[model samples]
Target: ELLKPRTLADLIRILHELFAGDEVNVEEVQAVLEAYESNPAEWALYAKFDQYRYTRNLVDQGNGKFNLMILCWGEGHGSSIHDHTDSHCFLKLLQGNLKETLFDWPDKKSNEMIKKSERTLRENQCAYINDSIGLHRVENVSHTEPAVSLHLFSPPFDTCHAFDQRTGHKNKVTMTFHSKFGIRTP
Candidate 1:
């Protein structure tokens, strides 16, 4: 019989197993995330906070299959408009509220981005996005509280583009982890 995962470490092991196959089943992956419940006490080690920008704490850099992380957003901290490119990105809200603003793919000729939708994600809400779904920028909306979220990226990517809102220019950037496996990277 397969044992159910009840802790963050267990969940990471299960996800590593799930992505070890020749092909990734999106539904299966999503289902695992959907079924897992959030427990703040269990996530204490990775729920790091930063004042200047959101912190991306690495949870697991799976065996070349995927990478899991915890993103902590301080008040007024949000991402620049960006695309996931070839990776599958899943985000589950853990604490506080986040405002997600979706945008359409930039116009090729003019490089102009169009706003598609805007919504607030509350605790326990899960959201998925990829290049096919366009782009997004998520922000911690509360003025006094910080936000925490769990993120999963399959076939982990180290580079992505961040578009300038005014010029619509795309800048290549390398991703960095604020912490690795519960320890600060320094």
Candidate 2:
């Protein structure tokens, strides 16, 4: 087995190098994350704890090409039904159980989620969705145990659209940074 990364920076270095100066899209990054997710030692740094709320902590926003995060999910919190828009997202479940459901939009303007697939990822499992292909909703399945994941985005996303489950209405929202480094925010 290849050696797992000891830190998030180490993992970023690998990622930056792998797709550096190439057409690094969703499928390419997804393949890379699947490989990394299977390696426990790589994401072990973030395997320690979860926050009180769903947290999307920016691990790094590289100069021009990539942005990464260490997301901490509380016992009952999770992300909204969302898409990357202009970014390609790749994620690895570092800890706990997370239910991920991918969907097809019958109408891109509305929130019609034609269920493509659903699966629960345990520790060390991974998944991804692209802007053009589909969208997803992830939830922490454990009532007692918190969940954590690592995410990577190419070129990053400033504003992405979120969907309403009941209304099927779509709205664009700004990405909020919950934490920078070890300091938390509101």
Candidate 3:
């Protein structure tokens, strides 16, 4: 009630508290993430955009329990269909619009990903997903405008399988951050 987070830093602190135990409450985390106002004045520092690809800027490393990030997408930028490994991935749209397409987990032998659903997340909208819900691909969906999304991953993962939409082939790829704690990486 009175302690609602009003800034990015405040949200980070609240997250730290929420994840300080042996287990994380998924619904609680979603509520907090959804409740946050998309304030550029507070998160503009981590909104680093890349010319070649979407940029993942680290906001806070949740001490092994989770990691928070601000992902900036240039016009038409998008991600390959990918699985989150064993982590819980939650994203909140901070600016512009993002089209998220969900795919059912590929067949074990054929590796064919089946389409499940597609939706657009507008500013301030939040989405929660995990490996159990299957794979996903996210895109800016704007020809001339950029988009920014806040992401939180629990039990942070380093590698995941990126799927080929047409062939259903999957490849393991390592993740990297474009910025760390507000500073751009080299």
lDDT of 2 by residue, 117-170 (tens): 889988766677786778788999788988888888877887887877755577
Candidate 1 lDDT over residue span 1-186, tens digit each: 134567777888888888878687777777677666788998889988887999999988898878999999999899999988699999988889899999877775655576789999888777888899888999997999899999999888879999887657889989888999899997
TM-score of 1: 0.92
Clashing pairs in 2: none
Most accurate candidate by TM-score = 3
Off by over 4 Å in 1: 1-4
lDDT against true structure, model 2: 0.71
Q: Estimate the overall C-alpha local distance difference test score of candidate 1.
A: 0.85
Q: What is the full ranking by lDDT, best candidate first?
A: 3, 1, 2
Model 3 compared with the native: what TM-score?
0.95
Backbone clash count, each prediction separately: 0, 0, 0
Provide the overall lDDT of each model, using Cα atoms, as 2-decimal numbers. 0.85, 0.71, 0.91
Query: Where in model 3 is the C-alpha error above 4 Å?
Result: 1-3, 109-112
What ordering of candidates by TM-score runs from best to worst? 3, 1, 2
Scored by lDDT, the top model is 3
